[PDB]
Design a protein around this ligand. Structure first.
Ligand SMILES: O=c1ccn([C@@H]2O[C@H](COP(=O)(O)OP(=O)(O)O)[C@@H](O)[C@H]2O)c(=O)[nH]1
Ligand SMILES: O=c1ccn([C@@H]2O[C@H](COP(=O)(O)OP(=O)(O)O)[C@@H](O)[C@H]2O)c(=O)[nH]1
Ligand SMILES: [Mn+2]
Ligand SMILES: [Mn+2]
Lengths: 258, 258
């Protein structure tokens, strides 16, 4: 199945760790599709090589270069850099169907069945459920769809300063049209939500297929005690998921790394 | 339109203040439907009278009495008292279509158009969006639907210890079947969510039709400074909505009260 892939992004070494963990978990759960990753020149040569091992295809995108299609839009909206680098997943015409996944996610069960959905399928975002979370979405690469996104971005920008605001403004019918485009929450389970309606997490949390480490703090911002096999919560620090992430990092990614 | 109504519940004087505020805001925004409220013998004679003024119909429900249909189910699940008292909204066969509304909600714009939806229509719950929030829902009274709920309650109880868990278990197809049953978030805007994805609140929060004071702290748990016309935040206290609530209470409810 060399026509369908999982696409991610990382513009630095930090998110690269995340992409490496994501990639490893996609293989670990036997995906039959490809694994593709968008990176930038800011990503180190070591992290780049590590990515070439895990990912089937590594695509470099440089929007600071006048040649790049999204370059002039960045001049008008200097704040949308990462957002514009991300929309390039639609430029991946070598693929028919894709599932973009944020570098801060982790797969816990095979999710190849996401490929039955059509553009654009996304799960609800907690906090504001009428907006879908752009961390996990099924889409169809197309230069047209891409140039249209680039236009909306230029014309009105993003109501949230990042991609989710933009992708929601463009695909504004997600909330009210066709329930098939509403991915179940367990395909993009936001790690911080675990305590907003805890009862529901105990009731359905075991069925979790994908964990998104949404928010300020990412898995790589913690420290892991290899001995205890759990995340370090010492000092003024405010778990099972952070551990699964680190387990995969420590066992699969570190050996390969550096 | 004496066949369609808004239904609420209050088992004590606290939530009665809320119901009174809700009722007032429903009238304040010219509803053409009826206003009905379920109460219990625990509600004071003064609050009862106040409710009889605001509401078109006040129904007493006593589930501690062996005669009540839901009485035997309460013996088996001693914790589901309020839950079972609330399900009685389905026993209101004198009404064809109804919109149940939690006593801790407030209306900010006419929402009579909710009557175009069919049982069961609800908005997503923040925290766990695949579950709908049982604070604002369109339903159809029926002794059958009612006895079925009473059964599910007895058989498996509730995964959250209250009605929302129960109503979600019964109407489990809400998440995946028919988008028309998904009420927009602005019809049950959970007040605590205002900071989980703040950007979206600024983008769509103005369109708010209904505010639900979800959670441990209710509007009547605060103190209002009549002079400043704002909620008192003095001492170890952790706003616009709490003010709208108190404004309606101070202007419309207090004069009538006591
Ligand atoms: O400096 C950055 C910020 C973001 N990203 C990528 O953009 C996605 C979206 O950002 P983030 O996950 O930080 O968003 P959040 O879900 O926390 O809002 C990340 O997963 C990464 O794949 C990146 O490569 N570099
Ligand atoms: O002791 C109680 C608890 C709840 N309620 C009613 O049940 C609804 C559901 O409860 P609550 O609003 O406390 O639920 P939450 O939305 O905060 O989970 C309330 O609005 C009231 O109408 C009541 O009458 N007495
Ligand atoms: Mn993310
Ligand atoms: Mn409530």
């Amino acid at each position: 199945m060399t026509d369908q892939a999982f696409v991610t992004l990382t513009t630095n070494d930090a998110y690269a760790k995340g992409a490496l963990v994501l990639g490893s978990s996609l293989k670990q759960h036997r995906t039959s599709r490809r694994l593709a990753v968008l990176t930038t020149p800011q990503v180190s040569d070591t992290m780049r090589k590590a990515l070439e091992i895990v990912f089937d295809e590594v695509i470099t995108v440089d929007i600071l270069d006048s040649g790049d299609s999204a370059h002039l839009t960045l001049m008008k909206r200097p704040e949308l850099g990462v957002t514009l680098t991300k929309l390039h997943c639609w430029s991946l015409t070598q693929y028919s169907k894709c599932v973009f996944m944020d570098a801060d996610t982790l797969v816990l069960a095979n999710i190849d069945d996401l490929f039955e959905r059509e553009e654009l399928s996304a799960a609800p975002d907690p906090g504001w459920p009428d907006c879908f979370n752009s961390g996990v979405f099924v889409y169809q690469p197309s230069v047209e769809t891409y140039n249209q996104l680039l236009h909306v971005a230029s014309e009105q920008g993003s109501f949230d300063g990042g991609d989710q605001g933009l992708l929601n403004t463009f695909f504004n019918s997600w909330a009210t049209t066709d329930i098939r485009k509403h991915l179940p929450f367990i395909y993009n389970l936001s790690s911080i939500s675990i305590y907003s309606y805890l009862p529901a997490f105990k009731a359905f949390g075991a069925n979790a297929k994908v964990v998104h480490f949404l928010g300020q703090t990412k898995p790589w911002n913690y420290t892991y005690d290899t001995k205890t096999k759990s995340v370090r919560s010492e000092g003024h620090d405010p778990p099972q998921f952070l551990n699964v992430w680190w387990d995969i990092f420590t066992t699969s990614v570190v050996p390969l790394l550096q």
